[PDB]
Amino acid sequence: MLMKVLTNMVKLNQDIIPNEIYLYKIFNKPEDGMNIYKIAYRNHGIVIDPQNRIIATPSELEYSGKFAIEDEISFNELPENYQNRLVLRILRDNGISDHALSRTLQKYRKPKPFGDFEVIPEIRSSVIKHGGDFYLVLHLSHQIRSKKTLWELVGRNKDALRDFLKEHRGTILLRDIASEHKVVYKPIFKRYNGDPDLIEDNSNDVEHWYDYHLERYWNTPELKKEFYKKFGPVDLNQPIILAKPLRQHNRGDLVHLLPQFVVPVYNAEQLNDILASEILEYLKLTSNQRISLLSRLINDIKTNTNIIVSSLTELEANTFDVDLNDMLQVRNADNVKVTLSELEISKTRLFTWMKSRKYPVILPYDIPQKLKKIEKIPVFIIVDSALSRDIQTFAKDEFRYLISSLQKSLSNWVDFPILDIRDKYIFTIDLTSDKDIVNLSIKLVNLMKNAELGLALIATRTKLPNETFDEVKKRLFSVNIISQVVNEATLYKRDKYNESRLNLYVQHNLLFQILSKLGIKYYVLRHKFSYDYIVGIDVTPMKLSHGYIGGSAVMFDSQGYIRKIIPVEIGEQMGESIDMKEFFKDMVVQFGKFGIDLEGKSILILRDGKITKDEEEGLAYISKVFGIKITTFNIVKRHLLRIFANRKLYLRLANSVYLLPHRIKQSVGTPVPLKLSEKRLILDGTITSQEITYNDIFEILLLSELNYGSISADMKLPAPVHYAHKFVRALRKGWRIREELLAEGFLYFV
Amino acid sequence: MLMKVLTNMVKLNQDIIPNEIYLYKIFNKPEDGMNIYKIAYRNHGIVIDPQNRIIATPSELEYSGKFAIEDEISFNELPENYQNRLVLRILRDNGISDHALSRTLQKYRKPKPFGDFEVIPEIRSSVIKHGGDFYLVLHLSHQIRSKKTLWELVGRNKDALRDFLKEHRGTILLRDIASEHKVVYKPIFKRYNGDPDLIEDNSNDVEHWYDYHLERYWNTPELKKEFYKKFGPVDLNQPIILAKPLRQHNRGDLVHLLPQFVVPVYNAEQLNDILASEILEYLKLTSNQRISLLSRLINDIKTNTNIIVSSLTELEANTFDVDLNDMLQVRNADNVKVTLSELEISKTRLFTWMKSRKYPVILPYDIPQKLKKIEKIPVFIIVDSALSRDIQTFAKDEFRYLISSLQKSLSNWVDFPILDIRDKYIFTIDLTSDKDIVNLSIKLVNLMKNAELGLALIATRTKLPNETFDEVKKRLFSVNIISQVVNEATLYKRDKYNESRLNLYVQHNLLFQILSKLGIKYYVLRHKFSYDYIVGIDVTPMKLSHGYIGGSAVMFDSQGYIRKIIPVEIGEQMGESIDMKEFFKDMVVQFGKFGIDLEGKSILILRDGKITKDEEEGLAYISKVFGIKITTFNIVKRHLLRIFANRKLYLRLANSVYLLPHRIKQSVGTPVPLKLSEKRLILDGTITSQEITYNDIFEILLLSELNYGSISADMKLPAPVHYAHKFVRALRKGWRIREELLAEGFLYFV
DNA sequence: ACAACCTACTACCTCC
DNA sequence: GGAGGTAGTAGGTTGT
DNA sequence: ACAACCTACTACCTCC
DNA sequence: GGAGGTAGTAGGTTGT
Ligand SMILES: [Mg+2]
Ligand SMILES: [Mg+2]
Ligand SMILES: [Mg+2]
Ligand SMILES: [Mg+2]
Ligand SMILES: [Mg+2]
Ligand SMILES: [Mg+2]
Ligand SMILES: [Zn+2]
Nearest CB to A546: which of B27, B254, B545? B545
Q: Which fold has domain A150-260?
A: Cathepsin B; Chain A (3.90.70)
Q: Do the chains contact at B571 and A734, CB–CB below 8 Å?
A: yes
Contacting residues for B401 by C-beta, under 8 A, at least 6 apart: B501
Binding residues of A for Mg(2+): 513, 538, 576, 608, 725, 750
Measure B481 CA to ligand 6 centroid, in angstroms. Answer: 15
Q: Cβ-count burial of A277 within 10 angstroms (0-12 exposed, 13-18 middle, 19+ buried)?
A: exposed
Q: Which amino acid is at A347?
A: K
Give the nearest nucleotide to B473, CA to C1'. F1
Measure B636 CA to ligand 5 centroid, in angstroms. Answer: 11
Strand E and B638 CB separated by under 7 Å: yes
Q: Write the CA distances from A614 to A577, A617, A620, integer angstroms.
A: 7, 5, 10
Contact A352, A359 (CB under 8 A): yes
The distance (Å) linking the CA of A252 with the C1' of F15 is: 11
Strand D and A517 CB separated by under 7 Å: no
| DSSP for residue B548 | B
Which residue of A217, A545, A584 to mutate against B (max B Cβ within 10 Å)?
A545
* SS3 label, residue A678: strand
CA distance A739 to chain B (A): 11
Give the closest residue to B679 by CA, choosing from B550, B528, B531, B527: B531
Contact A510, A486 (CB under 8 A): yes
Strand E and B641 CB separated by under 7 Å: no
Packing angle between helix B434-447 and helix B466-477, nearest 10 degrees? 20
Nearest CB to A544: which of B29, B211, B547? B547
**Residue A254 with chain B: CB contacts under 8 Å:** 30, 50-51
Nearest CA in chain B to A243: B51
Strands B686-689 and A552-557: unpaired
Return d(Cα A668, Cα A691) in angstroms, integer: 35
HEC sequence for A463-480: CCCHHHHHHHHHHHHCCC
Return d(Cα A153, Cα B536) in angstroms, integer: 50
Nucleic chain E: which protein residues 78-97 of B have CB below 7 A from it? Answer: 84-85, 88, 92
Contacting residues for B291 by C-beta, under 8 A, at least 6 apart: B6, B312, B644
Strands B454-459 and B426-429: unpaired
Q: Cβ-count burial of A716 within 10 angstroms (0-12 exposed, 13-18 middle, 19+ buried)?
A: middle
* Backbone φ, ψ for residue A277 (5° rounding): -65, -45
Q: How many Å separate Cα A165 from the centre of its chain?
A: 28
Q: Write the CA distances from B314 to A473, B306, B329, integer angstroms.
A: 61, 21, 39
**Residue B205 with chain A: CB contacts under 8 Å:** 25
Q: Write the CA distances from A678 to A238, A673, A720, B112, integer angstroms.
A: 57, 17, 18, 61
Measure A657 CA to ligand 1 centroid, in angstroms. Answer: 19
Strands A240-245 and A198-199: antiparallel
Contacting residues for B447 by C-beta, under 8 A, at least 6 apart: B378, B380, B424, B425
Q: Give residue numbers after which chain A breaks (C–N above 2.5 Å).
A: none
Which residue's CA lies closest to nucleotide E1 at its C1' atom?
B41
Give the closest residue to B257 by CA, choosing from B205, B181, B217, B216: B205
Return d(Cα B583, Cα B601) in angstroms, integer: 16
Count H helices and E strands in chain B, helices first.
20, 33
Contacting residues for B84 by C-beta, under 8 A, at least 6 apart: B126, B127, B128, B129, B134
Q: What share of chain B is helix, strand, coil (3-state, %, to 5)?
A: 30, 25, 40
* SS3 label, residue A282: helix
The distance (Å) linking the CA of B614 with the C1' of D11 is: 26
Task: List b or e across B452-471, with b for residues whose CB sees 16 or more CB atoms inside 10 angstroms.
Answer: ebbbbbbbbbeebeeebbeb
Return d(Cα B620, Cα B604) in angstroms, integer: 14
Q: Cβ-count burial of B350 within 10 angstroms (0-12 exposed, 13-18 middle, 19+ buried)?
A: buried
**Would an 8 Å CB–CB cutoff place A627 in contact with chain B?**
no
Contacting residues for A496 by C-beta, under 8 A, at least 6 apart: none
Contact B673, B641 (CB under 8 A): yes
Contacting residues for A174 by C-beta, under 8 A, at least 6 apart: A150, A184, A185, A186, A187, A241, A243, A257, A262, A263, A264, A265
Strands A629-636 and A602-608: parallel
List chain C nucleotides near protein: any atom < 7 Å from a Cβ: 1-16
From the CB of residue A181, how many other CB atoms can be counted at a distance below 10 Å? Answer: 9
Measure B729 CA to ligand 7 centroid, in angstroms. Answer: 21
Give the closest residue to B610 by CA, choosing from B660, B555, B542, B678: B678
Q: Cβ-count burial of B264 within 10 angstroms (0-12 exposed, 13-18 middle, 19+ buried)?
A: buried
* SS3 label, residue A389: helix
Return d(Cα A425, Cα B502) in angstroms, integer: 61
Contacting residues for B598 by C-beta, under 8 A, at least 6 apart: B587, B588, B591, B592, B626, B628
Pick the CATH number of A529-637+672-743 from 3.30.2310.20, 3.30.420.10, 3.50.50.60, 1.10.287.3240: 3.30.420.10
DSSP track, A680-723: EEEETTEEEE----HHHHHHHHHHTT--SS-SS---SS-HHHHH
Nearest CB to B441: which of A51, A574, A589? A589
| DSSP for residue A673 | P
B-contacting residues in A 194-233 (Cβ below 8 Å): 204-205, 208-209, 211-212, 215
Q: How many Å separate Cα A686 from the centre of its chain?
A: 33
Which of B118, B420, B576, B614 is flagged as catalytic? B576
Strand order in the sheet with A117-130: A9-11, A133-146, A117-130, A112-114
| DSSP for residue A520 | -
Quickly list H helices, B346-388.
Answer: 369-373
Q: Which amino acid is at A253?
A: D
HSE of B136 in the Cβ direction (CA atoms, 13 Å)?
A: 28
Q: Write the CA distances from A589 to A564, B230, B283, B450, integer angstroms.
A: 18, 56, 48, 18
**Would an 8 Å CB–CB cutoff place B432 in contact with chain A?**
no
Q: Do the chains contact at A208 and B250, CB–CB below 8 Å?
A: no
DSSP track, A350-361: SSTTSS-SSS--
Return d(Cα B395, Cα B484) in angstroms, integer: 13
Q: What share of chain A is helix, strand, coil (3-state, %, to 5)?
A: 30, 25, 40
* SS3 label, residue A591: helix
Return d(Cα B479, Cα B482) in angstroms, integer: 9
The continuous run of DSSP H or E covering A454 comes out as strand A454-459
CA distance A721 to chain B (A): 24
Strands B629-636 and B602-608: parallel
From the CB of residue B628, how many other CB atoms can be counted at a distance below 10 Å? Answer: 22
Report CA torsion sign: A617, A622, A627, A628.
Answer: negative
> Computed over its alpha carbons, how large is the radius of gyration of chain B?
30
**Would an 8 Å CB–CB cutoff place B442 in contact with chain A?**
yes
Give the closest residue to A423 by CA, choosing from A481, A380, A469: A380
HEC sequence for B271-285: CCHHHHHHHHHHHCC
Q: How far apart are the first and last CA of chain A?
A: 36
Return d(Cα A167, Cα A267) in angstroms, integer: 13
Contacting residues for B131 by C-beta, under 8 A, at least 6 apart: none
Q: Write the CA distances from B555 to B564, B675, B724, B727, integer angstroms.
A: 8, 22, 9, 12
Return d(Cα B203, Cα A414) in angstroms, integer: 79
Nearest CA in chain B to A579: B191
Q: Do the chains contact at B547 and A548, CB–CB below 8 Å?
A: no
Give the closest residue to A94 by CA, choosing from A295, A301, A313: A301
Which residue of A25, A63, A249, A441 to mutate against B (max B Cβ within 10 Å)?
A441
Measure A295 CA to ligand 1 centroid, in angstroms. Answer: 34
* SS3 label, residue A308: strand
Measure B746 CA to ligand 6 centroid, in angstroms. Answer: 13
Q: Write the CA distances from A590 to A56, A520, B346, B412, B725, integer angstroms.
A: 48, 22, 48, 41, 31
Strands A67-74 and A20-26: antiparallel
Q: How far apart are the first and last CA of chain B?
A: 36
Give the closest residue to A263 by CA, choosing from A178, A163, A174, A168: A174
Strands B674-683 and B629-636: antiparallel
Nearest CA in chain B to A440: B589
Strands B314-319 and B3-6: antiparallel
HEC sequence for A233-259: CCCCCCCEEEEEECCCCCCCCCEEECC
Q: For domain A364-517, which architecture applies?
A: 3-Layer(aba) Sandwich (3.40)
Give the closest residue to B157 by CA, choosing from B198, B194, B187: B198
Contact B57, B21 (CB under 8 A): yes
Strand order in the sheet with B9-11: B9-11, B133-146, B117-130, B112-114
According to DSSP, the residues that pair with A633 across neighbouring strands are A606
Which residue's CA lies closest to nucleotide E9 at its C1' atom?
B171
From the CB of residue B33, how many other CB atoms can be counted at a distance below 10 Å? Answer: 8
Q: Do the chains contact at A183 and B31, CB–CB below 8 Å?
A: yes
Contacting residues for A250 by C-beta, under 8 A, at least 6 apart: B30, B31
- Catalytic: B538? yes
Return d(Cα B667, Cα B286) in angstroms, integer: 8
The continuous run of DSSP H or E covering B657 comes out as strand B656-660
Strands B426-429 and B418-420: unpaired
Torsion of the alpha carbons at A190, A196, A202 and A207, rounded to the nearest 10: 130
Return d(Cα B80, Cα B129) in angstroms, integer: 7
From the CB of residue A565, how many other CB atoms can be counted at a distance below 10 Å? Answer: 21
**Residue A548 with chain B: CB contacts under 8 Å:** 545
According to DSSP, the residues that pair with A386 across neighbouring strands are none
From the CB of residue A304, how many other CB atoms can be counted at a distance below 10 Å? Answer: 10
Contacting residues for B743 by C-beta, under 8 A, at least 6 apart: B566, B594
Return d(Cα A309, Cα B425) in angstroms, integer: 77
Ion ligand 1, residue ranges at CB < 5 A: A 608-609
According to DSSP, the residues that pair with B11 across neighbouring strands are B135
CA distance A574 to chain B (A): 5
CA distance B455 to chain A (A): 19
CA distance B544 to chain A (A): 5
Give the closest residue to B403 by CA, choosing from B448, B455, B463, B337: B455
The continuous run of DSSP H or E covering B477 comes out as helix B466-477
* Backbone φ, ψ for residue B46 (5° rounding): -130, 175
* Backbone φ, ψ for residue A25 (5° rounding): -105, 125
* Backbone φ, ψ for residue B486 (5° rounding): -120, 130
Q: Do the chains contact at A581 and B434, CB–CB below 8 Å?
A: yes
Question: How big is chain A, counted in residues?
Answer: 750
Give the closest residue to B555 by CA, choosing from B570, B575, B541, B540: B570
Q: Do the chains contact at B542 and A547, CB–CB below 8 Å?
A: yes
Report CA torsion sign: B513, B519, B522, B523.
Answer: positive
Contacting residues for A72 by C-beta, under 8 A, at least 6 apart: A20, A21, A22, A23
Return d(Cα B698, Cα B279) in angstroms, integer: 38
Domain boundaries, chain A: 3-144+279-317, 150-260, 364-517, 529-637+672-743
HEC sequence for B38-106: HHHHHCCCEEEECCCCEEEECCCCCCCCCEEEEEEEEHHHCCHHHHHHHHHHHHHHCCCCHHHHHHHHC
Return d(Cα B468, Cα B490) in angstroms, integer: 19
The continuous run of DSSP H or E covering B743 comes out as helix B739-743
Task: Give the closest ligand to the alpha carbon of residue A484.
Answer: 3
Return d(Cα B129, Cα B125) in angstroms, integer: 14
Contacting residues for B14 by C-beta, under 8 A, at least 6 apart: B133, B134
Q: Write the CA distances from A160 to A34, A151, A157, A206, A370, integer angstroms.
A: 46, 10, 5, 19, 57
Quickly list H helices, B555-643.
Answer: 580-593, 613-625
Technique of determination: cryo-EM
Nearest CA in chain A to B215: A66
> Computed over its alpha carbons, how large is the radius of gyration of chain A?
30
Which residue of A542, A596, A615 to mutate against B (max B Cβ within 10 Å)?
A542
**Residue A27 with chain B: CB contacts under 8 Å:** 208-209, 212
Measure B638 CA to ligand 4 centroid, in angstroms. Answer: 11
**Residue B446 with chain A: CB contacts under 8 Å:** 593
Return d(Cα A404, Cα A396) in angstroms, integer: 12
List chain F nucleotides near protein: any atom < 7 Å from a Cβ: 1-16
Return d(Cα A350, Cα A357) in angstroms, integer: 13
- Catalytic: A576? yes
| DSSP for residue A547 | S
Give the closest residue to B522 by CA, choosing from B363, B681, B380: B363
The continuous run of DSSP H or E covering A425 comes out as none
Q: Cβ-count burial of A451 within 10 angstroms (0-12 exposed, 13-18 middle, 19+ buried)?
A: middle
Contacts 24+ apart (CB under 8 A), B96-103: B96/B125, B96/B136, B96/B307, B97/B125, B98/B122, B98/B123, B98/B124, B98/B125, B101/B125, B101/B138, B101/B297, B101/B301
Return d(Cα B705, Cα B703) in angstroms, integer: 5
Q: Write the CA distances from A513 to A352, A705, A709, B32, B81, integer angstroms.
A: 16, 16, 5, 52, 60
Q: Which fold has domain B525-637+672-743?
A: Nucleotidyltransferase; domain 5 (3.30.420)
From the CB of residue B670, how many other CB atoms can be counted at a distance below 10 Å? Answer: 21
